[PDB]
């Protein structure tokens with residue numbers, strides 16, 4: 001089997017991407033944030049504290065003839081930005097782009113933090129990291145991909161995120177029309193539960209490539225590109241007036257700037273992030289100070305190849321017996 005679904009930016013800055021997901025019988029369609037940096041499929045629901053729902057579409061398990069409470073199971077998760085959610089668990093039928101899993105754990109939120117309530121466009125998350133990170137207790141649950149994998153034509157999914165435009169998540173096949181050139185595959189460590197790999201270096205604009213190993217994770221659920229402070233300083237030094245602002249929480253730059261591109265290495269191959277992709281717009285409405293899309297990972301504890309990087313590539317998440325990651329230009 002295969003599946004194919006369109007993923008759409010939630011706003012004009014590509015702050016996140018939402019993909020429609022069918023849950024239950026009859027189908028209830030929710031728009032979920034596909035997150036290769038976590039491993040829980042959770043939804044706003046009829047169980048979510050009413051004051052914490054503000055415009056999201058909810059899953060109502062009592063209206064699904066295939067829903068079953070997973071008795072005794074609870075979940076609780078917190079993300080790198082400090083947001084969080086928690087609740088109980090149902091199993092139900094979940095379909096993405098025509099690919100169906102029966103018995104998928106659907107984690108129903110009883111509580112969500114303010115940043116979830118405040119984002120009316122995101123109805124929940126669909127985790128695509130390794131199932132070892134799933135938070136359900138006392139019986140850990142499998143991700144949608146883990147449950148689907150044996151049925152897929154090939155044990156892969158691909159992320160093809162757009163810059164200020166829709167893109168595609170495919171399951172079970174590699175669309176050879178969706179990228180240019182060849183796909184370069186690179187090793188993955190699953191030891192921390194992530195799609196963790198090592199970039200071979202970087203360049204800023206038209207500058208020379210610096211060969212240096214940069215461990216990090218391929219994370220569709222993180223907006224920006226978080227890299228070591230040395231690398232990030234080298235980038236922003238090429239932008240007149242750019243500075244790290246403790247009050248804003250990262251590098252800012254004059255909105256009048258033309259940002260340089262940023263290149264990262266995948267083996268001997270190179271992925272070029274256009275300067276436009278690094279612009280996250282005014283820090284507050286009407287400001288002439290703009291927020292940068294490349295930020296320091298110092299104090300995160302891991303480098304993160306988030307959407308800023310991934311949207312410049314066609315990315316293969318290869319779930320073969322030994323997982324790997326593939327990157328192609330597009």
Ligand SMILES: Cc1nc(N)sc1-c1nccn1C
Nearest residue numbers: 255257258259260275276279
């Ligand atoms: C700040 C910026 N740097 C580029 N290379 S294009 C660009 C920009 N200004 C306004 C919108 N966008 C995308």
